[PDB]
Nanobody, 129 residues
Framework: QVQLQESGGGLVQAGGSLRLSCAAS????????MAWFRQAPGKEREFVAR????????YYTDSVKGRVTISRDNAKNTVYLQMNSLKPEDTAVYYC??????????????????????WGQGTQVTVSS
């Protein structure tokens, strides 16, 4: 058995900063994959990051490399992201969810709605000027 929690979620204007996090309780996170997705208005949904509970073969968006911080801990089973100088292209709803897994090259093998143990609680980002 595991529990999930979400924090830091909020809406901040252009040139400001935003910090996002997901946390899990229990020691079996090595069989629960976290996945991050983005919904931009007028477009289809896209993937952002693929988080593996064993600490191996993780994926993330390279377009923000060195502009954001990404922190992950397999002892605590927690995830923290930090973002600075927000822009109009960041205007979206972000989602995080956790599903039962063993190993992957893509979270699409474990993105079934029955295999997600916990999902929703998305963060909308409202940008101005």
């Amino acid at each position: 058995q595991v529990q999930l929690q979400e924090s830091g979620g909020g809406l901040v204007q252009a040139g400001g900063s935003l910090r996002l996090s997901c946390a899990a309780s229990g020691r079996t996170f090595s069989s629960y994959a976290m996945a991050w997705f983005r919904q931009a208005p007028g477009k289809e949904r896209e993937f952002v990051a693929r988080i593996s509970g064993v600490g191996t073969n993780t994926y993330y968006t390279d377009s923000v490399k060195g502009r954001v911080t990404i922190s992950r801990d397999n002892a605590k089973n927690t995830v923290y992201l930090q973002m600075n100088s927000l822009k109009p292209e960041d205007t979206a709803v972000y989602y995080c969810a956790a599903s039962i897994y063993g190993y992957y090259s893509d979270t699409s093998y474990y993105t079934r709605l029955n295999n997600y143990l916990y999902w929703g609680q998305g963060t909308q980002v409202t940008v101005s000027s």
